[PDB]
Design a protein around this ligand. Sequence first.
Ligand SMILES: CCOP(=O)(OCC)C(=Cc1cc(C(C)(C)C)c(O)c(C(C)(C)C)c1)P(=O)(OCC)OCC
Length: 279
Amino acid sequence: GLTEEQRMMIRELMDAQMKTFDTTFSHFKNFRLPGVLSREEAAKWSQVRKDLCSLKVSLQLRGEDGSVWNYKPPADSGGKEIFSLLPHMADMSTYMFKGIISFAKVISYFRDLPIEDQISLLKGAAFELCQLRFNTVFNAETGTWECGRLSYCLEDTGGFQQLLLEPMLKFHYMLKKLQLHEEEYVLMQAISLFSPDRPGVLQHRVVDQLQEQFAITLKSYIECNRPQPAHRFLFLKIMAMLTELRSINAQHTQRLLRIQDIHPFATPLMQELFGITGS
Ligand SMILES: CCOP(=O)(OCC)C(=Cc1cc(C(C)(C)C)c(O)c(C(C)(C)C)c1)P(=O)(OCC)OCC
């Protein structure tokens, strides 16, 4: 029951996703790994500890030869050990950000925007699109993001309910429970990417019209393909999660800048996307 334009729109988005989402992470290489073996500033450190303590994961690397490396992070002992996985995660996030920049650039609707708006939209949405792609490799039964030969497992710290307190973790579990199709994930990416109210966007009206068309396409897709009672209000649930994801983006951006202030680690691409000039 989709129009021809809506069908073409999903086709273009799915093409872009297929071309730019390395779901096996085969080309993620040469990344860093954790090493083997005042008053104003003290308040900053206390906040940064809170920014990180509920986001801890262990890391597993499965070798092509069948070997397995496993890393368990240190406990918070008041020192720099809370940062041990940040270079690695900066490298993974940077890899993902390159993929979502590539995703945007192959979409006609994005390519046709002024280059300054393209940059403003990617700066605005990079974390959101990255997390949406990460949700598709999230295993909610094991609390693990399965990234090809790499796995990131939430540290069983509190318990299951106490871990749902962290908004980005609650988001991953809640989104996984909706059991979305690839097409619904890629339309979520489009709706996030074409957000007319990101800082710096000049073509507000064009971007707003584009976003509405992606949202209408998603609404129509769901109506045409999901008649089951479980999917009543699914479109509205998804849109509400996209609004929540924008809020989480702002909050994790604040965490990033707080950490960067006392412990610089952002890669050059992260600096460009999240507003760090190099002073
Ligand atoms: C705003 C920029 O954030 P960011 O890309 O930065 C890279 C360091 C970032 C990325 C990130 C976040 C999560 C949570 C939040 C779902 C736990 C992950 O599970 C993962 C992996 C790689 C393990 C799948 C990466 P951040 O939210 O979490 C990493 C600690 O970083 C905010 C400081």
